[PDB]
Design a binder for these strands. Structure first.
Lengths: 381, 381, 52
RNA sequence: AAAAAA
RNA sequence: AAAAAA
RNA sequence: AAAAAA
RNA sequence: AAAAAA
RNA sequence: AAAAAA
């Protein structure tokens, strides 16, 4: 009686994150500078030419690590006026000091851009291995009207933000899926259809986003800044806050799914005592998921320290049950790979059979809600 | 005592179909597209010219497999307004994706139809081997008044729906029988008498309906949609729901017949112990025949998996008995072929003799119903 | 929210409730002579539920 | 003291 | 770590 | 994303 | 383990 | 699989 109250407080502080008082500057990463080219002026011509040079900058093999990181941050912030104030607002990272150099257009330079310095600029910005748009009839995207820039910018960013959904979880599998989101934005007339980048260009970005952590911290934390914008967003932000729904819980699909099929379906095989403790583990992780705040759905994009805590190994039987339930109830979850060292297939087939036995077997915990008679429950069977 | 209750539950789940919970998208057929030409507009002139081109489209040897399938589905749905909504309502087939292209009339085309595209259309729609109406005085059926179209459409469809009755069971035998239904609809003034298609045209359709399964699933499942229409049907639907009575149990005549002559006549040679178990097999198939629902009478048109279960091999003695009873009691069933590897002619002649011995031998299970005396039973003998 | 292309018309999408959507597709085909003209073709359609 | 846990 | 989601 | 709505 | 079953 | 059925 007093054991169960002591047990409930024992389990919730075991999952509870340690309260981060802080070490007063003790643990600080050594910072490497990242060269972020930001347009010098508000005019469209500069934004357009910098977007032209940064897109082909990324494709070449020659570019190093943080040169590719700053070129990506260079175009993930071209949609705002004053991109320099956007970067310093977002970078709460300890490992990275962003030094950001303004880029103004020029007449004398080979690339057409100088730094606000004409040969150091082209040394920054500069045939089968070069990545580009997949229809090679387009050589230069430099445009003049700003809505022609704003459509050619979202066509580039909607092919980079969709990579973040499936960069840490399924890089190999991913190329099949981001073409479906490309059909979504082409048919919505959000993006321009002929400017689809090569898979070779995107494999440079996708193996970059998967590799470094400092780019995934920037990309998550600006999405969390896009989401906070009060009014109607600018039309690139209202697209970046459209792609994010594919990134929200991108890798918690052994926990989000278990809750969806184990807990919520409420088959009578939850009153097993074998599950009676792994519900109490899982009711704490549901309470923990808003204790983590709004950075909770991105805890495996960001590689947070407590995505080990939402792992299915702490509830391996109730996970396998909700694997068994969700194979029949989804034609999509048949494509889900779930192979782990704690799989327990005995439970999985017990959870498969609960779906099959109760096929036309209208419940008792939702029939009193409606008033289902024995006359009515036979008609469903 | 408790053996017989255990025996009765053992036999009914042996016949009971496995409850179809579903594999969640695991088993999906590769879909081939089928070109279905549907009239672009509601006007009669288009319907009439498309019916003209699709009738001669079918006759030529050049047409392939699914080109003949879509041309048949193209005319099996011309009787409705908006034929495009009829097709998507019916096709629950996994093996077939219907892509359906609208067809509008034209002035410049050779055939007279274009696709809503003038040379791709005639490449779709286009002398002894060509099939046509058997009186060659009629070259073009294109008409203008809609009741002249509605009579020339039912004249075509009443020669195609009658093929489904005897397409999977007796293709070779069938041509003798669908001329009797043609006399039925000519004398009822349902069809126009001079527009009888060649047997060479119908042999293209009949060897098509017999061959593919995806056309027989469409033709059955729209009949089941014609049957559900609440009010008085349109006059083509009230004719398609007239032909269906020749298709209801078209191939269960070793089971429907056995019940009609074995079970229902109730000769005293059913209290044989040799039949006492094959009644209990056959009382489950009668209970199973409405457990299958309204798609039960079409289970051998559709080639369902459990028309092996209504086969006479599970009750081969009581089948042969009801073969013996039904030869004398019908001048029609003398034309029935019943030749199988399980025939057992010993029983067949025991069932023939029960008809002959009890010729004028008024029963005891129906005489108490009326009050038949020995005075009255001698008058029948 | 879908005229304006709001960010949370992905949230009212039928993919988060794909079985109960297909059920209400199955109910609404017979109960409307209008909804027979509705195109509903998605990668999450689940026709088993639709015919139930 | 013993296992497993993206 | 894995699926699907206008 | 899809139908219908004096 | 054994047959037959559109 | 097989007949007949305004």
């Amino acid at each position: 009686a007093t054991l169960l109250r002591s047990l409930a407080l024992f389990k919730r502080n075991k999952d509870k994150p340690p309260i981060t008082s802080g070490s007063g500057g003790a643990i600080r990463g050594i910072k490497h500078i990242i060269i972020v080219p930001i347009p010098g002026d508000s005019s469209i011509t500069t934004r357009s030419r910098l977007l032209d040079r940064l897109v082909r900058l990324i494709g070449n093999p020659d570019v190093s690590g943080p040169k590719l990181t700053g070129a990506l941050i260079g175009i993930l912030s071209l949609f705002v006026e004053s991109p320099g104030q956007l970067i310093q607002r977002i970078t709460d990272d300890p490992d990275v000091s962003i030094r950001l150099l303004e880029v103004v257009q020029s007449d004398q330079s080979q690339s057409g851009l100088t730094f606000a310095m004409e040969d150091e600029a082209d040394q920054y910005f500069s045939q089968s291995r070069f990545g580009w748009f997949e229809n090679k009839e387009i050589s230069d995207i430099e445009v003049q009207d700003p809505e022609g820039f704003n459509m050619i910018l979202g066509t580039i960013l909607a092919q980079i933000w969709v990579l973040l959904a499936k960069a840490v979880t399924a890089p190999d599998t991913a190329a099949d899926s981001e073409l479906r989101r490309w059909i979504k934005y082409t048919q919505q007339r959000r993006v321009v259809g002929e400017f689809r980048l090569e898979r070779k260009w995107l494999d440079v970005v996708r193996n970059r986003i998967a590799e470094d952590l400092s780019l995934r911290r920037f990309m998550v934390a600006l999405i969390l800044d896009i989401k906070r914008t009060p009014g109607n967003k600018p039309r690139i932000a209202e697209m970046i806050c459209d792609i994010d729904t594919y990134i929200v819980e991108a890798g918690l699909a052994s926990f989000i799914l278990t809750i969806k099929f184990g807990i919520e379906t409420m088959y009578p095989a939850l009153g097993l005592h074998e599950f009676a403790g792994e519900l109490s583990t899982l009711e704490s992780l549901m309470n923990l998921y808003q204790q983590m705040g709004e950075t909770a759905p991105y805890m495996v994009i960001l590689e947070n320290s407590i995505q080990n805590k939402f792992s299915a190994g702490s509830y391996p039987l109730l996970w396998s049950y909700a694997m068994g339930v969700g194979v029949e109830l989804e034609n999509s979850m048949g494509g889900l790979n779930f192979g782990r060292s704690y799989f327990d297939p005995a439970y999985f087939r017990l959870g498969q059979e609960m779906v099959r036995r109760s096929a036309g077997k209208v419940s008792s915990t939702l029939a009193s809600e409606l008033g289902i008679t024995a006359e009515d429950a036979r008609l469903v069977s």
